């Protein structure tokens, strides 16, 4: 039995044309859990919607999906990269601060009919290690208290967690968190990207011989193993699968290997409009335009070259390898970041004969 | 500004052919409140599903309708005519018994995602008047405590109540109940039926000059006015609207007036299969077969004659008069018993050009 999770994002509504992603684009039985990114943590530690139409439109639209998938669970995620850590740090620092946050959170979850809560603090530091654990222990205790009122099933509680072993060491009490979190969404991606001066793999399954020694742990296999070594049971370790890629502008268009020199991020793409990233469906458009694809069998990922633009990304072949490896190694399951980067219409790519969600469907197909 | 309620019944799934009623037959915005008839009160005072597929199929099927109507509220009803009063009487007799029931009910409501509770004890007698009020005060108190315990909006709490002024006098502390019930569903129907040896009107809007004095209050106008006179604010009095009729077999096929002698109940009909009752859509079937309709302008209701079969029923004209009257007198709103007696497929009646719910649609159309 495997967890299959999927992140919905409340800013994908702003993509133009056929990139615009609405709750109704979800397909029944793709995911057992949808994680809603993101709510907002106010300065006064209360919780509220982040986008103007979360409560009135998008939350109900996502909850609607339970009509064709009765087992679907929808959790609210809080935090993320852009939110930073300053407010989390102060909120977790005292019992009174944490109690105020937990009270606001529980009311927000109940009023909006969520099934659980996904804590995406990116990331707790050494100074936060104790406070982060207390926060998690007190969230679970509250959720249990709420369930005891009526003998109902309790809200779920998960967390998205760093794949960097040094970060894991500093911020997480792993054996203690295993008793309190239902599972952890391992963020084993963004290992390399436009912040570096040479091309590299966003989410390699295995290390490559040409990896420098400092990066030998910076892959799916070793990052997940580290969490297991630190005391997290494998069934609680959920492997993260990106449906986006990261891109560079090459210094030299004749040097296109992994590790080739770069002069900066890739040019912002048509739908994501953000330098240095690309969606899978945008990759399909570039392939139709004649972009060159290379399969890197060592890491089990492809990369794309179009002129001086170079992207590391994930596709059906890399997802197949990774999801089969999840079964083989008996980790807890998979989750995808995000629903809205796949070919969710089936019309952006030609090679899948119009199949919707050619990437994300693989979870149900292989693990289901 | 006006309550619009509708009763769903969990035995309408057993009617044949186009009489079979499924939750997906509900039409968005017909009702603001759906009342689910009925749960089961066990001998030990605990609450449970009545039909084998309530929890597994029908409850979530009704809840699904919130997807196309986000403001829909679904309440669970307990009691009804066939349940009788024996268990209610024992359950309400002591604080201990009521607390066991209330704890069981609150758990059942929250486990099954109900928005509220509708108490249909038919009917508290003089020996129950104090216990009935205590039961209602304690239900509301628990609902308020549960709301704080689980950080949710409190469950709604209604009751379906007698329209017989003698029964109201004996069983209901009307000013005290107004303080704890959100509103009352006035059962201003079944005033006359096959238990009587002569024909009469199921739910007359007004009294008729030929009514004997014993029945001067047995109509919508006076029974609702009585609840008002007894201390229930008009905005808490919800006027009941039947979508069924009641029938007799005439003693003399040449004597077809209101008050004509009868020798027994009407023959059981094709879909309801219960002697003495008929659905509106079954009346439509008989109108197509040449039955005679008579409009009684005094009561603002029609009756149907077909051979020696005689039915008092309600139709678009009687519903129009009653619902427009509700607005004129500023009562609290209307409710229909039941969704499954209307022409809910639009397949039985011809005078409405295939309109679904020709009767029940009038609530939305007139009360807004």
Residue numbers in the entry:
A (entry chain B), B (entry chain A): 32 to 399
Give excerpts from the publication:
Here, we focus on the identification and characterization of proteins selectively secreted by the first larval stages of T. suis. We screened a set of n = 6 recombinant larval proteins for immunomodulatory properties and identified an enzymatically active T. suis chitinase that interfered with recruitment of immune cells and inflammatory reactions in a murine model of allergic airway disease. While our in vitro data suggest no direct immunomodulatory effects on, e.g., DC function or T cell activation, we observed disease amelioration to be associated with suppression of eosinophil recruitment into the lung and increased numbers of alternatively activated RELMα+ lung macrophages. Since mammalian host chitinases, both true chitinases with enzymatic activity (AMCase and chitotriosidase) and chitinase-like protein (CLP) molecules which can bind to chitin but lack enzymatic activity, are implicated as either mediators or biomarkers involved in airway inflammation and fibrosis, disease amelioration by treating with a worm chitinase was rather surprising.
